[PDB]
Design a protein around this ligand. Structure first.
Ligand code: IHP
Ligand code: ZN
Ligand code: ZN
Ligand code: ZN
Ligand code: ZN
Ligand code: ZN
Ligand code: ZN
Lengths: 44, 34, 143, 167, 29, 141, 254, 299, 285
């Protein structure tokens, strides 16, 4: 299975469409309560 | 960093794999044979 | 001289009275194609076209649907001769869309994120009075 | 525009492409210039296919301008497709094309014979292209993928670089 | 051109092993 | 895997060894990041709400391990009661007019949604900038 | 909690639910179609960029160049949609990159077989008559324009001007009436739920009168052999045999 | 093992376990109802098709032959669990049906609530509403007592209401939520009713002929609601010893019905959790969330 | 996937829409193509986009767009003046290419979250830079560029103009020139030098008015505090000699075995120490 995935990427060249909207939740490392509006996280 | 260059040779050919058949001499026969 | 009408039939009975304004709008369109591209930026180079097109189609749309001064014969003649726009008029019959600019502004795909351009968004929501010009169209607040 | 951009992209300022797609040189070339300026078959094939279409389209354009006539235009179109080998030069770069050329010559014999049967003489005016037109389309159906692959590589070398390795 | 006389072409700082190389520096010519 | 086992606090001393930043859980240097599957529509509601008025309910998971709190400037939030952009505002104010002719019968005349806000058609500054420009020019010399 | 606050809460909830579960946002929504644009848009883009030598344009120069790869594709679609000699003006659908780099003709020339044949049979007749009758049939000169002559803006010359009569033919009002009203239109019976499938323009179905009229129109291009006996050893089977045995049948292929 | 299920293209809002513990039912925003094998390889068989709105709530009847489905298209469907054929459409409410319950034991009954502010009693054999209780605020969650005499409704008024089928009066009001109630559920004994609410409070209320008169029997904590404003549902364990309620913080919370200690806080979900269900025989939890995946936790 | 960012770039909104291109741009340092991220930071903001590839950030530990350290928000020249210059990295051409390659494998083999060798060093800090580190987000940095039609007096977009209408910066100021490569390597960085000049004036470490004096003249005591606060703060240092206390002017004198310890207590203390939630200020004599 792993090899096949790899092969398909290589083969992408020979055969010249992506539609995902994907959300992520982020914790910063700066924090401090004045860095964001005041959220331990953000969403992107 | 994979180039968009191509070549004639590279293109698909013989995408199917000819498996041996039973009368051609499949491994099944071989294992059993003396 | 004219659009060099395709149909070769004679236009319908109602033509003579809507002739002039179509003549003048199309003259305006030709002027708009000609005028050139100095400090005009670029995305602003296409605007007058969309605007005039909206004008023409709004005209025939008004005459047929509102004032009722045209027979379907003449209406569809002005559609199939390409004076007016089919799709756009098909929007303006909808509930919400009645002032629409373009069929670009409501195409979802054409944005980065698949959303209709701020072109659409009602003024009440922006709530700043901030000033807006649709980079496609040249709208400011369709709705 | 494409072909001029290619030419400029490589700084070949001593070449000149005219509007019927004849690539000429401005001046007598220096040895070094001659090396650098050669185009391969990909570019020339493209150029000649474009030339063919320019012949066609121009013919229609003169009809629309009222310089020609319907019947004359039809005859011109038949001429064009039957005479590609002597108007273009496509073959130079691909010799296989001769296969289409021969077809067109034969069909012109065939049709011209039947057409000019009675009172009608050996004169110039026979329109009846449909046949010749077919032939070039079949050609194009196949050659398209070839040119996509070859021009693809040409562009890729131009932008990515000749992959320098002795590979 | 400056891959030589400006900036040490490619640098491998020696790996550091059980002893103190912090202090060491060397004299000019 | 029970609550007792999974969530038992890590034992005893904390080593100052790590910088405020070093002490934080991480996946990718700058912080910890992971998938989420939030209903797109709600995202739009929160994003516009914040963008327009400054107050949007915060997304967090472990802020207190339970959450009671808005995350906006909040002047609007108390006053506006979390008005959603999609939901109609309780009150309306301060419309600004743009001249329009919509018949299209007229030529040149016609403005559609192309209507140029009637209202909107420093000298003091007009000088500082100029000076700066001059200086820049001189520097090019 | 107060009545006022409850009412308020309810209101907001209503609007939230209405939007979150709105039909358009419905799971597998697929929204709209790429509605086509005013033709002047593409006209002006190319006219602006006519030589991408303008200092302003810059970035198109890279983009335009890139397209070259699909130019032959474009050519094939152009050529296969030529207008035929009985049409004055054929309009075609076009996809042009928003940049003006490339225009493709997005269309396949489908025709109703017996109609098509008939029409070129008509042209056979006409062309033959024209050649007979003109004293001197002057033929065009190739290239029709000079190299140093730049390509024409359609809009500046062509657009304004008349189309000048096509070849046509004088069909009898009486005998050829079935066929006669739509014979020389572009895609004859596209708008008719009686004769063709529809705007996909597949599957035609006519009456026998139509068929007989078309047949008669087509006669000059048509074989008069009703049996299969003519082609005895001139068929494909014979040719195959002939090939394999390295023989030729007197007037067949070697 | 844990077992991870996937297939729903959109958010999963509800999931249930068949009364006999042989299969699962799940549905959400996609509009498909999927059936799953609880054992074997956890295979998926029939897909129920026919809902045009999203599926807001599933239930099985006590026999496990009938599956009820409240949709946002204002229709409550009755499904045959065996074949997957649709039985009836309860067309009636003027707005979205937020939730539905089927009376156990007694002759077939169904209760619904919707955004029109009403609660309706349905006899599946009549194709018409039997009784209507106009509230005034949109209704989110509704359940019957074991005697099939009373209707328990949770809305956005922070007040759980109890309705008498014979008198047709507001019999009971429960105060103790500070915000909207999103999910209600009776104990298997009839003894206790479980509620979730925006205020992040899980509250158990006891309903009895003879009542203390301030039935805030117990309060639990941990469960967080947020800007998604998803409906949140809670469930009783088969024996009434454990309480599970989903949250928006990616954790499944399970509490001890007595001591109120958090037994489990479980991760694995990426987004908000919409419903948690207990297998009727064995300590197995099905957790459904907006991340479109289900887990089969075993305790 | 996902960039590495300052909290100051990313935005002051918690909700953010951020787009991604597979190989968008070359990085202006190691000069390779890399995934690029755009997003809008805020209402009047500029659409920032990552300027350098993720690797050479992990290498010098910095935001992708700003190139300011993650923890300190300081230009690299600064935090190197603050600890360790000897990190280095070849500037020169094909070396740069080579060293980047290898270090890219080394990073590939790390736990992933760690700026390579620097982090072994990066923990020990606070000398100065903490005190010169910036505290709050600085949004003036994302404002749109200065409209360059208007700065010639002409701009014909009127109020619509998204650019900014105001006086630019006089090209005289050495703080103008600011190359990117330059800011990255820590060469002659005007900003960094300015911050260095600011570092020096910090009244702090020279001390030593008199020999052997361990006397500490402590101002801003306050009458909430006890001595025991003092001792249980100061036993870390060593053997106290004694402590003199005055609560009438709220000044506390202190004395240690060695002057070294007194210098220390200054250092550790000065404009840093606070106990009893009240600032404890220190001076010599
Ligand atoms: O009679 P026309 O209408 O003028 O046709 C002529 C002619 O045909 P015939 O001589 O058979 O009447 C040529 O025949 P040859 O002079 O070569 O015997 C033929 O030449 P090909 O045999 O090569 O077809 C020539 O074409 P071309 O002038 O290119 O040779 C073609 O007229 P077109 O040039 O009008 O085809
Ligand atoms: Zn518009
Ligand atoms: Zn718009
Ligand atoms: Zn608009
Ligand atoms: Zn780099
Ligand atoms: Zn940055
Ligand atoms: Zn400006």
């Amino acid at each position: 299975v792993a090899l096949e995935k790899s092969v398909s990427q290589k083969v992408a060249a020979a055969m010249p469409k992506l539609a995902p909207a994907q959300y992520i939740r982020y914790t910063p490392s700066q924090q401090g309560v004045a860095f964001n509006s005041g959220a331990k996280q953000r969403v992107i | 960093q994979l180039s968009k260059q191509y070549s004639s040779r590279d293109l698909p050919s013989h995408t199917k794999i000819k498996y041996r058949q039973t009368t051609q001499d499949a491994p099944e026969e071989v294992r059993n044979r003396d | 001289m004219p659009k060099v009408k395709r149909s070769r039939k004679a236009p319908p009975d109602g033509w003579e009275l809507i002739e002039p304004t179509l003549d003048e709008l199309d003259q305006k369109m030709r002027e708009a194609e000609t005028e050139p591209h100095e400090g005009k930026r670029k995305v602003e180079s296409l605007w007058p076209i969309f605007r005039i097109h909206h004008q023409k189609t709004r005209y025939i749309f008004d005459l047929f649907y509102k004032r009722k001064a045209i027979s379907r014969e003449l209406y569809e003649y002005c559609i199939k001769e390409g004076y007016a726009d089919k799709n756009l008029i098909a929007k303006w019959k909808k509930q919400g869309y009645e002032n629409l600019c373009c069929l670009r502004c409501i195409q979802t795909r054409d944005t980065n994120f698949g959303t209709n351009c701020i072109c659409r968004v009602p003024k009440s929501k922006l709530e700043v009075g901030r000033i807006i010009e649709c980079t496609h169209c040249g709208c400011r607040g369709c709705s | 525009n494409m072909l001029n951009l290619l030419i400029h992209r490589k700084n070949l300022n001593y070449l000149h492409l005219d509007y019927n797609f004849n690539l000429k040189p401005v001046k007598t070339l220096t040895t070094k210039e001659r090396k650098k300026s050669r185009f391969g078959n990909a570019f020339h094939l493209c150029r000649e296919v474009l030339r063919l279409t320019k012949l066609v389209v121009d013919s229609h354009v003169q009809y629309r301008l009222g310089n020609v006539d319907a019947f004359q235009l039809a005859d011109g179109l038949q001429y064009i497709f039957a005479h590609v080998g002597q108007l273009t030069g496509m073959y130079r770069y691909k010799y296989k094309l001769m296969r289409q050329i021969r077809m067109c010559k034969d069909l012109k014999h065939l049709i011209y014979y039947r057409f000019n049967t009675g009172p009608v003489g050996k004169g110039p005016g026979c329109g009846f292209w449909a046949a010749g037109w077919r032939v070039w389309l079949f050609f194009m159906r196949g050659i398209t993928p070839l040119l996509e692959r070859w021009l693809g590589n040409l562009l890729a070398r131009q932008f990515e670089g000749r992959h320098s390795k002795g590979v | 051109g400056v891959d030589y006389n400006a900036e040490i072409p490619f640098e491998k700082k020696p790996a550091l092993g059980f002893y103190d190389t912090s202090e060491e520096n060397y004299q000019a010519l | 895997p029970t609550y007792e086992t999974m969530f038992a606090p890590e034992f005893g001393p904390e080593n100052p060894f790590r910088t405020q930043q070093m002490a934080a859980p991480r996946n990718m240097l700058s912080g910890y990041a992971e998938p989420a599957h939030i209903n797109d529509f709600m995202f739009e509601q929160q994003r516009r709400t914040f963008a327009t008025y400054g107050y949007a309910l915060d997304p967090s998971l472990d802020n207190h391990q339970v959450s009671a709190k808005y995350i906006g400037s909040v002047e609007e939030a108390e006053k506006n009661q979390g008005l959603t952009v999609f939901e109609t505002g309780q009150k309306k104010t301060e419309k600004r007019k743009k001249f329009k002719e919509n018949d299209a019968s007229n030529i040149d005349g016609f403005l559609g949604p192309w209507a140029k806000y009637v209202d909107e058609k420093s000298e003091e500054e007009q000088k500082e900038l100029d000076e700066i420009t001059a200086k820049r020019q001189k520097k090019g010399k | 909690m107060s009545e006022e606050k409850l009412q308020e809460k309810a209101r907001k909830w209503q609007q939230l639910q209405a939007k979150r579960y709105a039909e358009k946002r419905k799971f597998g929504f697929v929204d709209a179609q790429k509605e086509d644009m005013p033709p002047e848009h593409v006209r002006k883009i190319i006219r602006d960029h006519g030589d991408m030598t303008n200092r302003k344009f810059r970035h198109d120069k890279r983009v335009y160049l890139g397209a070259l790869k699909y130019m032959p594709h474009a050519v094939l679609k152009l050529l296969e949609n030529m207008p035929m000699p009985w049409e004055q003006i054929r309009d075609v659908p076009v996809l042009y990159h928003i940049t003006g780099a490339i225009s493709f003709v997005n269309e396949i020339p489908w025709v109703i077989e017996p109609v098509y044949i008939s029409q070129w049979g008509s042209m056979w007749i006409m062309m033959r008559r024209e050649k007979r009758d003109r004293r001197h049939f002057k033929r065009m000169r190739f290239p029709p324009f000079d190299d140093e002559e730049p390509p024409l803006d359609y809009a500046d010359n062509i657009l304004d001007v008349e189309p000048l009569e096509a070849i046509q033919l004088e069909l009898d009002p009486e005998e050829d009436a079935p066929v006669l009203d739509w014979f020389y239109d572009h895609q004859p019976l596209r708008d008719s739920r009686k004769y063709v499938n529809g705007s996909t323009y597949q599957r035609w179905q006519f009456t026998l009168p139509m068929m007989s009229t078309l047949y008669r129109l087509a006669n000059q291009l048509l074989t008069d052999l009703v049996d299969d006996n003519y082609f005895y050893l001139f068929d494909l089977k014979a040719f195959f045999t002939s090939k394999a045995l390295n023989m030729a049948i007197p007037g067949g292929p070697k | 093992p844990i077992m991870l299920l996937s297939g729903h293209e959109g958010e999963v809002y509800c999931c249930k376990f068949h009364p006999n513990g042989s299969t699962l039912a799940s549905a959400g925003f996609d509009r498909l109802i999927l059936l799953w094998n609880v054992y074997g390889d956890c295979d998926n068989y029939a897909t129920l098709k026919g809902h045009s709105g999203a599926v807001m709530e599933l239930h099985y009847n006590t026999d496990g032959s009938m599956l009820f489905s409240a949709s946002t298209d204002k229709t409550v469907a009755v499904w045959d669990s065996e074949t997957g054929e649709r039985v009836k459409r309860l067309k009636g409410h003027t707005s979205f049906v937020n939730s539905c319950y089927p009376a156990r034991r007694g002759p077939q009954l169904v209760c619904t609530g919707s955004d029109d502010g009403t609660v309706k009693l349905w006899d599946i054999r009549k194709k018409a509403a039997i009784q209507t209780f106009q509230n005034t605020y949109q209704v989110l969650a509704v359940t019957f007592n074991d005697t099939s005499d009373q209707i328990i409704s949770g809305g956005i008024d922070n007040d759980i209401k109890v309705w008498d089928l014979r008198q047709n009066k507001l019999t009971y009001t429960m105060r103790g939520h500070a915000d909207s109630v999103t999910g209600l559920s009776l104990s298997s004994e009839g003894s206790y009713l479980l509620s979730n609410a925006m205020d992040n409070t899980v509250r158990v209320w006891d309903v009895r002929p003879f009542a203390p008169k301030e039935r805030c029997v117990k309060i639990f904590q941990g469960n967080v609601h947020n800007f998604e404003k998803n409906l949140l549902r809670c469930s009783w364990s088969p024996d009434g010893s454990k309480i599970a309620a989903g949250s928006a913080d990616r954790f499944v919370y399970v509490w001890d019905t007595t001591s109120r200690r958090i037994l489990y806080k479980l991760p694995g979900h990426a987004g908000s959790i919409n419903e948690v269900a207990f297998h009727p025989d064995e300590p197995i939890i099905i957790s459904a969330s907006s991340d479109k995946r289900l887990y089969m936790g075993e305790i | 996937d996902f960039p590495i960012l300052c909290q100051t770039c990313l935005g002051e909104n918690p909700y953010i829409r951020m787009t991604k291109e597979k190989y968008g741009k070359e990085c202006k340092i190691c000069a390779r193509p890399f995934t690029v991220f755009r997003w809008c930071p805020g209402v009047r903001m500029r659409f920032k986009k990552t300027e350098v590839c993720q690797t050479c950030s992990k290498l010098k530990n910095v935001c992708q767009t700003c190139l300011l350290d993650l923890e300190y928000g300081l230009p690299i020249q600064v935090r190197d003046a603050g600890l360790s210059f000897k990190d280095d990295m070849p500037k020169s051409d094909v070396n740069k290419e080579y060293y980047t390659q290898n270090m890219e494998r080394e990073i590939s083999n790390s736990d992933g979250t760690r700026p390579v060798g620097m982090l072994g060093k990066a923990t020990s800090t606070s000398d100065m830079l903490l005190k010169l580190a910036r505290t709050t987000p600085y949004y003036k940095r994302n404002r749109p560029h200065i409209c360059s039609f208007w700065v010639k007096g002409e701009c014909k977009r009127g109020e619509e103009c998204p650019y900014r209408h105001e006086k630019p910066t006089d090209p005289d100021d050495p703080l103008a020139d600011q190359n990117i490569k330059d800011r990255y390597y820590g060469i002659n960085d005007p900003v960094a030098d300015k911050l260095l000049k600011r570092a020096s004036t910090m009244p702090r470490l020279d001390p030593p008015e008199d020999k052997t004096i361990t006397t500490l003249y402590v101002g801003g005591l306050g009458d909430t505090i006890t001595e025991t606060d003092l001792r249980n703060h100061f036993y870390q240092f060593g053997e106290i000699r004694t402590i003199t206390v005055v609560q009438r002017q709220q000044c506390a004198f202190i004395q240690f075995a060695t002057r070294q310890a007194a210098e220390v207590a200054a250092e550790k203390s000065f404009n840093k120490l606070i106990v009893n939630g009240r600032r404890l200020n220190v001076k010599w004599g």
